Amino acid sequence: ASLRDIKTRINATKKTSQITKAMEMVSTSKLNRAEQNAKSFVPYMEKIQEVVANVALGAGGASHPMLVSRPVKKTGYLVITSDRGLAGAYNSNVLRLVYQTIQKRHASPDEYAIIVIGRVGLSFFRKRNMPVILDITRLPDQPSFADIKEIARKTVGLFADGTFDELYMYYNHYVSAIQQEVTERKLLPLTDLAENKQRTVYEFEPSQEEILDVLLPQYAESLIYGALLDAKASEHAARMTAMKNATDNANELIRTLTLSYNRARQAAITQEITEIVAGANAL
């Protein structure tokens, strides 16, 4: 069955297997660096969680607009997607769950606003004609704090103007390298909060209110950056798993095409030997 075409198809799928194997190793190294970046972020997060728990859970503290739940006239959305493709069900699962949770319970384009992180989610919500009020893209593979910090302070200050009235986060939770679970984490109002099994009372140097006014935007920014690093780690792991599955599919195609190659090779040699011996019998 056209032996040379089978041979060129074998060579082309071998080269696709080589490219996807190299992409798997690159994304494995990027997953290692993303796990190192998350482990670098860990102690700041546990300390800010300790301080916010011990302050906001003691001596009232529910007078701040970020603790108590105001009535809901709008709902913000912080969607964390990727800038680049070749991750399999990363962006599809996140954007599908965001689209389901928006179209399920609002049924009006003025009742929500969406803040995306990534070009894929941005193109998604511009194809679906949804508002993309805060829209930064082009993040590094191991992102630092300042580039997400400016959009995080704009998000918190856009809540503090009275616009969002609540918002949520959507990101892939990196558990171990194969699942990448989709999470809906409520960003703020900070109703869901828990003390660290033992508490010490604090002395507030300006007052409690000014300390909350400085601290709670920083806690929201730290939550956003922790979810963002966790989503980037799940991005590199999902691209690794997708390229590993691409190598496996390419190798299965290699072995079936070599079976068909051997069939066409045997058929070609028996055809040419029948032609030569028939021409010799002709004389």
């Binding site: 799928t13 696709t16 996807t20 493709g85 070749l86 991750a87 399999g88 069900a89 599809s92 194809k127 997708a242 599955n245 691409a246 599919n249 390419a250 195609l253």
Partner: protein, 116 residues
């Protein structure tokens, strides 16, 4: 078009166009998967699975093979059926509901017997 009709010809050639476009994507689907198609090729694959399964049909002869009694489909009925599939009317139904089914009313009753 001069032998069969204009609308029959348009539906048949559009079915062949979507099936050829799905045939040209089987290497990308076989290696990289359904994940990297650019949201119109996903729609082509999604409608083309439904078309390739709705081409299949239960026979009166195959009642001795499976027990399903078999069907006879008029030409206007199957042209209306493939036109409704090409317009995207039945994108919400599962693709295994179209297997071995005469008409699209039978598609809908099989899909609500499945649970959709």
């Amino acid at each position: 078009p001069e032998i069969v009709g204009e609308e029959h010809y348009q539906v048949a050639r559009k079915v062949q166009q979507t099936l050829q476009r799905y045939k040209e994507l089987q290497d990308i689907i076989a290696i990289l998967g359904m994940d990297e198609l650019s949201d119109e090729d996903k729609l082509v694959v999604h409608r083309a699975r439904r078309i390739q399964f709705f081409l299949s049909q239960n026979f009166h002869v195959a009642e001795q093979f499976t027990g399903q009694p078999g069907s006879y489909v008029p030409v206007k009925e199957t042209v209306r059926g493939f036109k409704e599939i090409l317009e995207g009317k039945y994108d919400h139904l599962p693709e295994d509901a179209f297997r071995l089914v005469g008409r699209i009313e039978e598609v809908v009753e099989k899909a609500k017997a499945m649970g959709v």
